[PDB]
């Protein structure tokens, strides 16, 4: 009961009714390339980098969004769903400022990888790029937001996981900038999580600005002692001094989030 | 067209508490 059978490339996985197309691929084990979709954040559909092709259907569907229906076989590695990613990645990269050797989310980029695995070998954007104006969101998060792919996960977290409801989108067109309209710092606990949740390195951590680069960091899994929730955390150490503490997921205690104090 | 000496240039990583010079 309550177990539709949907095929992910003919694997007949069975899922509860109401599971998204992206979720159906996960249980088979396939990963839809995704931006703007975080498990504990509301589905928004902003990036549409997850377009897949349900069989016998005219258009490709939004994985994170379409509730999978009965007997719709998902074709995640079709000739179409790759032109639906080879052509989106064309766009995200087109307005992107190539300062990857500045972006300290160098190896921690969910946008170079997906470009480097699912995107395109070369660029055709012979036109000019855009630039936004760096502002102050506080003393912990450095928002070099010319990096932003307008994926609205910050505006969600800042409203849904934390109740700040401050960060918001401002304007329309290609100069929609997701920054506080008036310059009011994002002061709240749970603040630093925005860093971890922005896949782009637009806003990153200001103390850990340029002290390291992720491939080097040796990662040891340990426990938060600053507060009594005992949140799980990963201490990233390079050559013997701790460089960053970022969250590691514990369903029951800290589910992917850690306090501003303990990082 | 018409002896070095190697050294670490980084700072002290772990600064050390200094005891209070005020006796108690």
């Amino acid at each position: 009961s309550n177990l539709i059978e949907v095929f992910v490339d003919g694997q007949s996985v069975m899922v509860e009714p109401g599971t998204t197309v992206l979720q159906a691929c996960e249980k088979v084990g396939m990963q839809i390339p995704r931006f703007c979709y975080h498990e504990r954040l509301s589905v928004a559909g902003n990036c549409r980098m997850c377009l897949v092709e349900i069989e016998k259907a005219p258009k490709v569907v939004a994985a994170c969004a379409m509730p999978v229906m009965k007997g719709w076989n998902i074709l995640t590695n079709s000739e179409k769903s790759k032109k639906a990613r080879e052509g989106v990645m064309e766009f995200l990269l087109a307005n992107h400022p190539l300062d990857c050797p500045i972006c300290d989310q160098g190896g921690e980029c969910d946008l170079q990888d997906q470009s480097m695995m699912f995107g395109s070998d070369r660029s055709r954007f012979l036109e000019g790029k855009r630039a936004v104006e760096d502002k102050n969101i506080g003393p912990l998060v450095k928002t070099i937001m010319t990096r932003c792919i307008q994926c609205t996960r910050c505006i969600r977290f800042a409203s849904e996981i934390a109740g700040v409801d401050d960060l918001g989108t401002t304007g329309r067109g290609n100069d929609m900038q997701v920054g506080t309209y008036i310059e009011k710092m994002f002061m709240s606990e749970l603040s630093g999580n925005v860093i971890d949740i922005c896949p782009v390195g637009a806003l990153t951590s200001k103390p850990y600005a340029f002290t390291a680069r992720p491939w080097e960091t040796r990662k040891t899994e340990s426990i938060d002692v600053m507060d009594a929730v005992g949140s799980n955390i990963v201490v990233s150490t390079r050559t013997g001094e701790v460089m960053r503490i970022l969250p590691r997921m514990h369903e029951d205690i800290n589910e992917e989030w850690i306090s501003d104090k303990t990082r | 067209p018409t002896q070095y000496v190697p050294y670490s240039t980084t700072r002290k990583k772990i600064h050390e508490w200094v005891p209070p010079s005020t006796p108690y």
Partner: protein, 80 residues
């Protein structure tokens, strides 16, 4: 957000001394088994490696994200 590095089990030896080097300030280590992390496909096989090699082991159960119900329609609910 990629999960391809959370698939295979790894067993890692305990971390040891990393003193600063006086001449150049480079990190220096006296522990040979430090950088060694062996990768094993299943928990049973990794436990076997520890037993026959005689190293002490403390296995940690895999913790995988719990299924989470999501639906774009649900947040549009003014009610809640």
């Amino acid at each position: 957000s990629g999960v391809n590095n959370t698939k295979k089990w790894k067993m890692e030896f305990d971390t040891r001394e990393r003193w600063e080097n006086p001449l150049m300030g480079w990190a220096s280590t006296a522990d040979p088994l430090s950088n060694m992390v062996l990768t094993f496909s299943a928990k049973e096989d990794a436990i076997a490696f520890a037993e026959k090699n005689g190293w002490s082991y403390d296995v940690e159960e895999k913790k995988v994200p719990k299924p989470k119900s999501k639906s774009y329609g649900a947040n549009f609910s003014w009610n809640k």
